[PDB]
Symmetry: C2
């Protein structure tokens, strides 16, 4: 049901195709619209996309505006097709983009059966530092339920696809989904095809999932 995409490889794809980072991120933008179609058509109801980690916001200003603009451009183009929301380390993101993203959330089809949600500035340590400071001395006790209701990723994630040929989480691990299944693809994200997508879903659906228990 619930899929999280970690779209990676834009810088390398740009260099390999002799185009600008901006063109790489536009290719990403277009590929994200394709991908979502595939997802909807495969029974995904909620698609999280990790727009950025915390450390990604430490890249040069131009590289940062480039990913922000391209991710935002997807929402300007497709917002009436889905329910849109965003979350994360929003202190790391510029005011302009939060405004625009806020509006697009406003402008999106609150009634859709498909959700597309961005995490921005993703990072367990940032997430936990922020939650602690928001609730320190204001609640008697943290619980699982309070933590879930404050986590960046507000629901459980079943499947994670990460492109870009790197077998690591890169700060994108979902706090409350310990048993999320991971599919790593060596493909640079803008090269991703439907065959790639179907081979990922075929691997992910064949997994025997045990959630820390023994099959009885």
């Amino acid at each position: 049901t619930t899929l999280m995409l970690l779209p990676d490889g834009m810088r390398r794809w740009s260099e390999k195709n002799g185009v600008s980072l901006d063109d790489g991120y536009a290719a990403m933008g277009d590929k994200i619209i394709e991908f979502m179609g595939w997802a909807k058509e495969e029974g995904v109801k909620t698609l999280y996309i990790t727009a950025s980690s915390a450390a990604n916001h430490g890249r040069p200003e131009a590289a940062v505006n480039t990913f922000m603009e391209a991710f935002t451009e997807v929402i300007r183009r497709c917002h009436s097709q889905f329910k849109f929301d965003f979350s994360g380390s929003l202190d790391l993101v510029s005011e302009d983009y939060l405004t625009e993203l806020s509006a697009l959330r406003d402008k999106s089809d609150s009634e859709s059966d498909f959700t597309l949600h961005y995490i921005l500035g993703m990072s367990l340590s940032h997430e936990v530092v922020g939650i602690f400071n928001k609730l320190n001395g204001k609640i008697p006790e943290m619980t699982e339920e309070i933590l879930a209701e404050n986590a960046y990723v507000p629901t459980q994630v079943d499947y994670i696809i990460r492109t870009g040929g790197a077998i690591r989480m890169s700060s994108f691990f979902p706090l409350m989904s310990p048993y999320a299944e991971l599919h790593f693809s060596p493909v640079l994200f803008p090269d991703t095809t439907r065959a790639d997508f179907d081979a990922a879903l075929k691997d992910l659906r064949a997994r025997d999932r045990r959630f820390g228990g023994y099959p009885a």
Copy 2:
């Protein structure tokens, strides 16, 4: 340098060899003892071992006592050769084991250049719940530094090996190590050979690490 092992596949191993889960977990212990030896030869100084997740303690009580006894037994036999420590969701673990493991921590070699550290009850949600509640109202603010000194895994993790065929974290993601490299082996943990460990180490040492940044 800093390695975390997720030893998985003992119930499948036992089924394969038609033995009891006890015998499977005993073969695990023996294999842990070998693996530590390999790790030391290859320059590992701190070896973390995920003895259990939170949900693992939800297995039937006989299954729980088998993993707990087997992990404890490694330490009984080998505690004089390394510095031993343990952390995690210790409220989940039976008192008898906690007392014994603390006594073995005391008998272990405080001067060793090699640290073997068990995480018990590992789970990011349990972890963050426990940090919040221990510190709620007792510090002015949470910082990254303060979180790292309270996390289940008290240092940065470079590499993670996970055996058992499953390409997932299974509640074992290290809170403060977002860029830890992941190597997944299909081998059931008790069949692990030196050649498997060497290919894991070769793969992990060849990784091109970016920590969320771009190269200058």
